[PDB]
Amino acid sequence: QVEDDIQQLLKKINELTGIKESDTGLLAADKQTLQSEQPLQVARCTKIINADSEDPKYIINVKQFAKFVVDLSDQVAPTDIEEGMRVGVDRNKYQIHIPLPPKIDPTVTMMQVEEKPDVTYSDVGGCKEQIEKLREVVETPLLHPERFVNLGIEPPKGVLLFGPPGTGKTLCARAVANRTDACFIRVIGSELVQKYVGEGARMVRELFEMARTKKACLIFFDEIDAIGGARFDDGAGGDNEVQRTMLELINQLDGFDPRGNIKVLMATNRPDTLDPALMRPGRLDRKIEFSLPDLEGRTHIFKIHARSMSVERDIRFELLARLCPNSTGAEIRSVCTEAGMFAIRARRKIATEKDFLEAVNKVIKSYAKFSATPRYMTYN
Amino acid sequence: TDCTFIRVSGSELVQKFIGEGARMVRELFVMAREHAPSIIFMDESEVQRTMLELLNQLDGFEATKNIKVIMATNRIDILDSA
Amino acid sequence: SYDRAITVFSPDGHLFQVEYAQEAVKKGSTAVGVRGRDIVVLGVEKKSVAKLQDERTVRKICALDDNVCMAFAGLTADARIVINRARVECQSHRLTVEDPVTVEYITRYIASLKQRYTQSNGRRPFGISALIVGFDFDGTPRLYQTDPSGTYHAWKANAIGRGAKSVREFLEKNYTDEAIETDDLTIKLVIKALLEVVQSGGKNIELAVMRRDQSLKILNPEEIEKYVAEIEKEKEENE
Amino acid sequence: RYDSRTTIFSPEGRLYQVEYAMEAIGHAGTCLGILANDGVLLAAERRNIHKLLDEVFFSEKIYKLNEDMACSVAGITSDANVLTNELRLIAQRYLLQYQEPIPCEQLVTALCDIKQAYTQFGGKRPFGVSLLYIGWDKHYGFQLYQSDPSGNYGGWKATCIGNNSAAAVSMLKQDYKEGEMTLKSALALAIKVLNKTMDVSKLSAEKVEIATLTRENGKTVIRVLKQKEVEQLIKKHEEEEAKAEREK
Amino acid sequence: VLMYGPPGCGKTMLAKAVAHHTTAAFIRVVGSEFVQKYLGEGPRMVRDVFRLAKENAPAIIFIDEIDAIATKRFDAQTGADREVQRILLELLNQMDGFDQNVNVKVIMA
Amino acid sequence: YDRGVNTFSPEGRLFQVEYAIEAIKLGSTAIGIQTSEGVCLAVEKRITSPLMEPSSIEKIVEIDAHIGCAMSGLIADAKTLIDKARVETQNHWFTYNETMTVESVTQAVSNLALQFGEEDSRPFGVALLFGGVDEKGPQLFHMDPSGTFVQCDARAIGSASEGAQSSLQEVYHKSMTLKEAIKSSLIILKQVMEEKLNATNIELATVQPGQNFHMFTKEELEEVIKDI
Amino acid sequence: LERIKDYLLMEEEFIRNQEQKQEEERSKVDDLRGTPMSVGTLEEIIDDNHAIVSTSVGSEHYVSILSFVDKDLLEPGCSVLLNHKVHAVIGVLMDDTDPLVTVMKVEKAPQETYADIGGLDNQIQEIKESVELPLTHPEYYEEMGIKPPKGVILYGPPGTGKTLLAKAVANQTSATFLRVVGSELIQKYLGDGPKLVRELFRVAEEHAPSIVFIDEIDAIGTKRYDSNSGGEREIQRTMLELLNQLDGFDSRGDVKVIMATNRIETLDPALIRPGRIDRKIEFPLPDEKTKKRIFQIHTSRMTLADDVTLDDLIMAKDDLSGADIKAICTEAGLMALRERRMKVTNEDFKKSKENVLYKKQEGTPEGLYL
Ligand SMILES: Nc1ncnc2c1ncn2[C@@H]1O[C@H](COP(=O)(O)OP(=O)(O)OP(O)(O)=S)[C@@H](O)[C@H]1O
């Protein structure tokens, strides 16, 4: 009953604490310019259908209501009230006053990277020839437009990348975005997957509007399975509008006046879920995969992931690369961090050989790998 | 019992066929709270994610108990592993 | 590859069915065996009496010669076939060569039969792993083990069947070079191994020894009872 | 998933046809044998007790195999004919080789190796037949054996057939006997077991089958007994049910 | 009643003849002429049954050409094992508890 | 797909042979080195248990009185091939009163390194290193599962064989000596093994033309290891 | 007597939950606003005191701004407060999100710490070192330049206490916490995968260092290959959205994820890579050494006659979950409560051990190695 005492008088003094506050409970840039702005007007932006001759007599739609027959107000520039220009239309005078920019959609401006994340070309080691081919794709036509002219050849404006998960696609993406110099655009695939009817098609329209504003810009796709390459359709009749958006993407993408000075990198873990309406070259010109580096690349990824962590100055990476039969830079970096955790399990200043030995154990030999214990000799 | 008995002897309908989904106890547990003494009854392993969500609503981490579920069918071995 | 059939390698270089036929051994009853210096010893656990039969026919420890002893794990029918063929082979070795059969010969035969059995078209692998204990050349005790792959592999002590890592860990944490045998130490080592069994019910213990010149001696579970009592006495002396 | 043929192993490793041969045992005729000295008996259930048969065979499950051994049977029927011919031929070849009757355990292991020859190889159907053994020797007396499609054989004193006979083995354990070698006691026990396990109401004697094996002076006669003693055994057991309802 | 047999010994003839000489509120129902890929529209059928049999006089409802379990947009994991089985057990769920007193005559053929 | 020893690839190739060359990689390492003074050879055992008796694990076996061997990967395919090599060299000495030279031995082995055929069994999963002293002095030889047999001056096999070859090409040249090559091998060994180098891990096998007999070093190997 | 204390504590906590300007300048704010305020969408801001908006019906107007707070706080993409007279731009909307943000936010630590489960403290030690160490003691990560792990998968046989581990880590924390049963995405809504995802992780970034806790999505690892002949629904697209949200671009920040599954091989191996999800933890049928601890916890505050030994039951059979032990410890108590008795004898535990263990039934060997 001592606990009764404890909790009871605790909560009782807490009740007192509540009773404490319960009993202790007892314009120049903002106000005098308001009524001046109250005679303004709620006049609507629009979008113009056509121009008649010799007069405006403009017909117009806003979004949803109808198709609006309007005038212009007298203080306009009557030249550029043409089609494709959103303009402002009155609620009493029904006449055009002020033009507006088009439907810019500044969530499509939101997929541009707007920054330069640092992952250096000296960090993506192991694939010195795949990244060499992608360097030929990216760096060379944007810097030396001679040898295409001086030999008479075409740029690979599309490069798909495929391979296992963990491999370096992301690194190559942000690596060329580290040394870019151009307008680099990330593309979330589900920025096309909006709710309503015929809008991701217009998202592809917004993409090509941003594209043909400028020069040498960089659209980067990733995870195009979200966009999709499966024309999966029989007598069930379910999900098909994303395929409409994607066929719109193919239409505005390639064939009948394609992009121009635009270099697009794509990525997928699933190449066998693609559409052969993008597998065709002319659209995608280098199907560059990556593979697991043998030992030199795995020692190299050891060098990159251990140059900036406290280790012994006696350890090698030959034997550790050996005990990675099949592994990636993600798994290697997990080994580095895991041996660091083992260094926190002791109280060290650096890491040793056996630290990374047991980290290789934890990563690969304590992978799940099913089922599970391989205890046999038969080999040694 | 004089208690908010409930019969959910229907079937794993709507899920993505003419409607949204979330059809076993998804909002039904919100109302098992809203009618705090209650008993739930079902005939019944059949679809493979909805029932799992709603296990994890019913299993331990739910609320004040006395809110019981009665599943009553024959032939045990036709069911899942949870 | 796939787990079908025995002839295909994995994409990363394995045979699935060799690793997989070891699992039936890995999921069998336990049987250990050590060598003393003059007396060899082994025994099985899990008598598993079902209250209503005889058990003199279910014996997992038999012999091929007057010098050699058997044990196995896994499933018992392959043990019956392999033992039947081993008797014939041991007698045929006795037919030409007039020696008492060396243990290394019969283990090479069993492993060779097992591997040429595994190589062929659709012959199901023998899901056993035998323990072949004997002392022939100047009474030198030897014990070899097998594998579904067919690898005879000479040891000094052994543990197979269910949970063999713990049992072999007990032989690792016991296994003293001193002294010597000393048959008493070998007997007490069997007592400590059977006390270190996965269950150690006290009545499911079956052990048989050979003093490298005699034949097999099947014990009586009262001598073993006093053995368990003195093991408990030494365990009390630890306190 | 890992179904296809009898070979090769499953990834744990278990077997496919072995378990399924056991589940092919479970839907068959129910047999048992009893613990008895100075004699041993067999019980058997008549499949297809329909009124338009002949019963001129005197034995549908028992097969007097050598002279002093018979065997009951359970499972797929015509495989058992294949097995009984071969078994008779094995024991008779043994007698040809030695002029001594077969001491029954090497007979059992010979048949187990025959069955195991179709367990290992591929691709053949394993024999889905378990079957009993009664017999006599010079070395142990009266014996009882249980063959299994794996090739395992267990020497029992009170045996087991499939899904109809687990409750029978439960009754054999809860009603375990030892010391009483009297054949009539074992017959009353068998009557009690088949009364419980078979669903034949009041145990019509046409639906049962009883064969015994006694040692008479140097002969080891096998008594495939007639029907009148079965009738009065049923009357004996129902009078003992009247003794059991003296408790009301 | 569960009528069955050979196709043309008077199943549909007898049902339509009871419809000819009906007394109560008959409703002619073909099992799958108005199933609308709702795997469990048989529940909405029995909703109509319930509320229309007590909305009318007790309504006698024969279900012809019994196909109302297997519709054409079977769509689940195994080959409509649990789909056909779920609409069967659903049919059972709205078979056991009518009222024993909701006067609806249900017949299959 | 690829499934089967009787189907090529659209671009090559087997895909059973390739999976055998994959199956090499799991074995323990070994290093043999040709020197005009003689052939030396080394291996790692990877001892698991203290009960695992070290002299019973075979890596170096004896083919002839002057022809050694080493195995890799699968054990029992190696046991078969060793048995056959012993039988056939003995057959050569039978019908010729002389020693079958090491190239002819390995031709006799790779006559059925690929005689794999289950009808009209599987391909073997072992790499072999052959050393011997023919009339042409010492010889060092390397075969594969596919029977594609070649001479090698200093070949390394099995696990971690790439860096073994690289650091071997660092140290090797044509005019090496014996003891220098021995320590040059075991340096690479205790760079590619994981445990401490001691008396029980590795084993040497050296054959000389004047020391044809006893292609082995027994616990003077302790004295060799302690000299590093 | 303590029940009065607990009831008073709960009701005073509710009282505290009920315990949740300008005399004329605030009235001018009340006329800086039209009282039926509204929610709009800025497209552009031409900064000359009148802006262009967008509505949920789609009528877009030059509407003047009426700033009390800094009017340059709100942006295109941030909503506004428009009137119904001239839809006048009123002012400060602190950035609000979906209703489905407070739904997934547990506000309590209703259960207790590692002193609740019985004995797994090698991998409990792992999740300790991977959440409790980076949060509370973040020394060595900076002090050896090594980044902490991010993802933790719970798996194994069910009822091991995956839920118990979840709520245990939900106790011992000062970082903010979120509770997501991640399979909730069964709609007939195209898109709508990324809406919950982007808003969840934006909220997670805006508040604090946090754990973002996904729970039981082992069904949703849809094989990463297709759906068969015609499939594509949305589910692959939604999991790929979550994948790109996790280990794409846009640096992860101080956000943690712990995940739990029952079956594990049916997952999506595009997620299980390290970096994307770092740790994997086995929760097997434990031992016969911490079963003593699970019985110890489950016999902490119950009336047990100490004559009986639970180690007899532990010696009986060896493979069952700790949830089975809880079921036994309650069920034998009910068997004791058959007839108004004080404590529990052995045979209630025997009948309860038999009663709960009606689970595994197969069949027919093995059993027959043998
Ligand atoms: N050479 C390398 N050096 C350093 N890190 C590497 C290297 N190769 C791969 N990585 C790791 O792999 C990551 C990049 O590859 P991924 O993240 O797998 O691209 P991805 O988008 O995840 O691919 P998927 O198939 O969509 S999961 C890096 O962030 C590292 O964790």
PDB file of N, CA, C and O in Angstrom, chain A residues 267-298:
ATOM      1  N   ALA A 267      16.094   4.930 -65.823  1.00  0.00           N
ATOM      2  CA  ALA A 267      16.560   3.856 -64.965  1.00  0.00           C
ATOM      3  C   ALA A 267      15.392   2.952 -64.620  1.00  0.00           C
ATOM      4  O   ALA A 267      14.256   3.414 -64.485  1.00  0.00           O
ATOM      5  N   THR A 268      15.691   1.665 -64.484  1.00  0.00           N
ATOM      6  CA  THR A 268      14.704   0.664 -64.095  1.00  0.00           C
ATOM      7  C   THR A 268      15.436  -0.537 -63.523  1.00  0.00           C
ATOM      8  O   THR A 268      16.531  -0.876 -63.981  1.00  0.00           O
ATOM      9  N   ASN A 269      14.889  -1.114 -62.462  1.00  0.00           N
ATOM     10  CA  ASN A 269      15.349  -2.409 -61.990  1.00  0.00           C
ATOM     11  C   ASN A 269      14.738  -3.540 -62.800  1.00  0.00           C
ATOM     12  O   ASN A 269      15.275  -4.651 -62.798  1.00  0.00           O
ATOM     13  N   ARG A 270      13.622  -3.278 -63.466  1.00  0.00           N
ATOM     14  CA  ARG A 270      12.854  -4.291 -64.172  1.00  0.00           C
ATOM     15  C   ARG A 270      12.864  -3.985 -65.660  1.00  0.00           C
ATOM     16  O   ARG A 270      11.974  -3.277 -66.146  1.00  0.00           O
ATOM     17  N   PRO A 271      13.848  -4.477 -66.413  1.00  0.00           N
ATOM     18  CA  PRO A 271      13.843  -4.236 -67.863  1.00  0.00           C
ATOM     19  C   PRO A 271      12.807  -5.057 -68.593  1.00  0.00           C
ATOM     20  O   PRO A 271      12.320  -4.625 -69.641  1.00  0.00           O
ATOM     21  N   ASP A 272      12.418  -6.205 -68.042  1.00  0.00           N
ATOM     22  CA  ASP A 272      11.477  -7.098 -68.695  1.00  0.00           C
ATOM     23  C   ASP A 272      10.034  -6.651 -68.491  1.00  0.00           C
ATOM     24  O   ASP A 272       9.107  -7.339 -68.931  1.00  0.00           O
ATOM     25  N   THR A 273       9.811  -5.509 -67.841  1.00  0.00           N
ATOM     26  CA  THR A 273       8.486  -4.913 -67.741  1.00  0.00           C
ATOM     27  C   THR A 273       8.365  -3.665 -68.610  1.00  0.00           C
ATOM     28  O   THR A 273       7.461  -2.852 -68.412  1.00  0.00           O
ATOM     29  N   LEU A 274       9.249  -3.509 -69.586  1.00  0.00           N
ATOM     30  CA  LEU A 274       9.240  -2.322 -70.420  1.00  0.00           C
ATOM     31  C   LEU A 274       8.307  -2.492 -71.607  1.00  0.00           C
ATOM     32  O   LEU A 274       7.732  -3.555 -71.852  1.00  0.00           O
ATOM     33  N   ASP A 275       8.161  -1.412 -72.351  1.00  0.00           N
ATOM     34  CA  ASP A 275       7.388  -1.340 -73.563  1.00  0.00           C
ATOM     35  C   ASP A 275       8.343  -1.254 -74.736  1.00  0.00           C
ATOM     36  O   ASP A 275       9.279  -0.445 -74.705  1.00  0.00           O
ATOM     37  N   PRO A 276       8.149  -2.041 -75.785  1.00  0.00           N
ATOM     38  CA  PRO A 276       8.982  -1.884 -76.983  1.00  0.00           C
ATOM     39  C   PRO A 276       8.604  -0.693 -77.852  1.00  0.00           C
ATOM     40  O   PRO A 276       9.078  -0.576 -78.986  1.00  0.00           O
ATOM     41  N   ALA A 277       7.751   0.188 -77.340  1.00  0.00           N
ATOM     42  CA  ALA A 277       7.578   1.524 -77.882  1.00  0.00           C
ATOM     43  C   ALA A 277       8.532   2.522 -77.232  1.00  0.00           C
ATOM     44  O   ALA A 277       8.412   3.729 -77.466  1.00  0.00           O
ATOM     45  N   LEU A 278       9.453   2.039 -76.397  1.00  0.00           N
ATOM     46  CA  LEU A 278      10.624   2.790 -75.961  1.00  0.00           C
ATOM     47  C   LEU A 278      11.914   1.998 -76.078  1.00  0.00           C
ATOM     48  O   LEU A 278      12.991   2.605 -76.058  1.00  0.00           O
ATOM     49  N   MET A 279      11.842   0.667 -76.208  1.00  0.00           N
ATOM     50  CA  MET A 279      13.022  -0.160 -76.459  1.00  0.00           C
ATOM     51  C   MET A 279      13.679   0.140 -77.798  1.00  0.00           C
ATOM     52  O   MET A 279      14.845  -0.219 -78.000  1.00  0.00           O
ATOM     53  N   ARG A 280      12.940   0.730 -78.731  1.00  0.00           N
ATOM     54  CA  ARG A 280      13.473   1.038 -80.047  1.00  0.00           C
ATOM     55  C   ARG A 280      14.593   2.067 -79.948  1.00  0.00           C
ATOM     56  O   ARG A 280      14.443   3.074 -79.243  1.00  0.00           O
ATOM     57  N   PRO A 281      15.729   1.839 -80.599  1.00  0.00           N
ATOM     58  CA  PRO A 281      16.780   2.853 -80.633  1.00  0.00           C
ATOM     59  C   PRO A 281      16.382   4.017 -81.519  1.00  0.00           C
ATOM     60  O   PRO A 281      15.549   3.900 -82.419  1.00  0.00           O
ATOM     61  N   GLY A 282      17.007   5.156 -81.250  1.00  0.00           N
ATOM     62  CA  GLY A 282      16.499   6.421 -81.731  1.00  0.00           C
ATOM     63  C   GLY A 282      15.809   7.095 -80.569  1.00  0.00           C
ATOM     64  O   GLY A 282      15.927   8.308 -80.372  1.00  0.00           O
ATOM     65  N   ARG A 283      15.090   6.293 -79.782  1.00  0.00           N
ATOM     66  CA  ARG A 283      14.568   6.716 -78.490  1.00  0.00           C
ATOM     67  C   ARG A 283      15.607   6.482 -77.402  1.00  0.00           C
ATOM     68  O   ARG A 283      16.088   7.428 -76.773  1.00  0.00           O
ATOM     69  N   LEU A 284      15.970   5.222 -77.186  1.00  0.00           N
ATOM     70  CA  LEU A 284      16.971   4.838 -76.201  1.00  0.00           C
ATOM     71  C   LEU A 284      18.116   4.162 -76.931  1.00  0.00           C
ATOM     72  O   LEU A 284      17.928   3.111 -77.550  1.00  0.00           O
ATOM     73  N   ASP A 285      19.300   4.759 -76.846  1.00  0.00           N
ATOM     74  CA  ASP A 285      20.386   4.406 -77.738  1.00  0.00           C
ATOM     75  C   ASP A 285      21.518   3.665 -77.055  1.00  0.00           C
ATOM     76  O   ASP A 285      22.359   3.086 -77.749  1.00  0.00           O
ATOM     77  N   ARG A 286      21.572   3.666 -75.730  1.00  0.00           N
ATOM     78  CA  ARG A 286      22.540   2.858 -74.998  1.00  0.00           C
ATOM     79  C   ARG A 286      21.815   2.154 -73.864  1.00  0.00           C
ATOM     80  O   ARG A 286      21.320   2.804 -72.940  1.00  0.00           O
ATOM     81  N   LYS A 287      21.738   0.829 -73.943  1.00  0.00           N
ATOM     82  CA  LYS A 287      21.123   0.024 -72.891  1.00  0.00           C
ATOM     83  C   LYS A 287      22.217  -0.416 -71.916  1.00  0.00           C
ATOM     84  O   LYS A 287      22.535  -1.596 -71.770  1.00  0.00           O
ATOM     85  N   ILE A 288      22.807   0.572 -71.251  1.00  0.00           N
ATOM     86  CA  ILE A 288      23.984   0.337 -70.421  1.00  0.00           C
ATOM     87  C   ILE A 288      23.550  -0.265 -69.096  1.00  0.00           C
ATOM     88  O   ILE A 288      22.822   0.365 -68.324  1.00  0.00           O
ATOM     89  N   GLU A 289      23.998  -1.481 -68.825  1.00  0.00           N
ATOM     90  CA  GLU A 289      23.878  -2.032 -67.488  1.00  0.00           C
ATOM     91  C   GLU A 289      25.183  -1.844 -66.736  1.00  0.00           C
ATOM     92  O   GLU A 289      26.204  -1.448 -67.297  1.00  0.00           O
ATOM     93  N   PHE A 290      25.133  -2.144 -65.444  1.00  0.00           N
ATOM     94  CA  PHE A 290      26.316  -2.261 -64.611  1.00  0.00           C
ATOM     95  C   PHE A 290      26.375  -3.694 -64.115  1.00  0.00           C
ATOM     96  O   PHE A 290      25.347  -4.369 -64.026  1.00  0.00           O
ATOM     97  N   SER A 291      27.569  -4.159 -63.775  1.00  0.00           N
ATOM     98  CA  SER A 291      27.700  -5.473 -63.167  1.00  0.00           C
ATOM     99  C   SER A 291      28.591  -5.386 -61.941  1.00  0.00           C
ATOM    100  O   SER A 291      29.185  -4.346 -61.650  1.00  0.00           O
ATOM    101  N   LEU A 292      28.650  -6.494 -61.211  1.00  0.00           N
ATOM    102  CA  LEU A 292      29.413  -6.537 -59.973  1.00  0.00           C
ATOM    103  C   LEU A 292      30.900  -6.510 -60.288  1.00  0.00           C
ATOM    104  O   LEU A 292      31.372  -7.333 -61.078  1.00  0.00           O
ATOM    105  N   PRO A 293      31.655  -5.567 -59.729  1.00  0.00           N
ATOM    106  CA  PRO A 293      33.106  -5.551 -59.951  1.00  0.00           C
ATOM    107  C   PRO A 293      33.789  -6.754 -59.318  1.00  0.00           C
ATOM    108  O   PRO A 293      33.385  -7.232 -58.255  1.00  0.00           O
ATOM    109  N   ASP A 294      34.837  -7.239 -59.987  1.00  0.00           N
ATOM    110  CA  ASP A 294      35.415  -8.528 -59.636  1.00  0.00           C
ATOM    111  C   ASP A 294      36.191  -8.530 -58.320  1.00  0.00           C
ATOM    112  O   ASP A 294      35.693  -9.068 -57.330  1.00  0.00           O
ATOM    113  N   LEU A 295      37.378  -7.932 -58.265  1.00  0.00           N
ATOM    114  CA  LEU A 295      38.031  -7.656 -56.994  1.00  0.00           C
ATOM    115  C   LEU A 295      38.550  -6.227 -56.978  1.00  0.00           C
ATOM    116  O   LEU A 295      38.480  -5.565 -55.938  1.00  0.00           O
ATOM    117  N   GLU A 296      39.073  -5.758 -58.124  1.00  0.00           N
ATOM    118  CA  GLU A 296      39.682  -4.430 -58.194  1.00  0.00           C
ATOM    119  C   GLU A 296      38.670  -3.344 -57.912  1.00  0.00           C
ATOM    120  O   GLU A 296      38.958  -2.384 -57.190  1.00  0.00           O
ATOM    121  N   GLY A 297      37.476  -3.480 -58.469  1.00  0.00           N
ATOM    122  CA  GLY A 297      36.437  -2.529 -58.157  1.00  0.00           C
ATOM    123  C   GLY A 297      35.948  -2.658 -56.732  1.00  0.00           C
ATOM    124  O   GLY A 297      35.604  -1.665 -56.100  1.00  0.00           O
ATOM    125  N   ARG A 298      35.911  -3.882 -56.199  1.00  0.00           N
ATOM    126  CA  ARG A 298      35.457  -4.029 -54.821  1.00  0.00           C
ATOM    127  C   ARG A 298      36.494  -3.512 -53.830  1.00  0.00           C
ATOM    128  O   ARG A 298      36.135  -2.886 -52.823  1.00  0.00           O
TER     129      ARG A 298
END
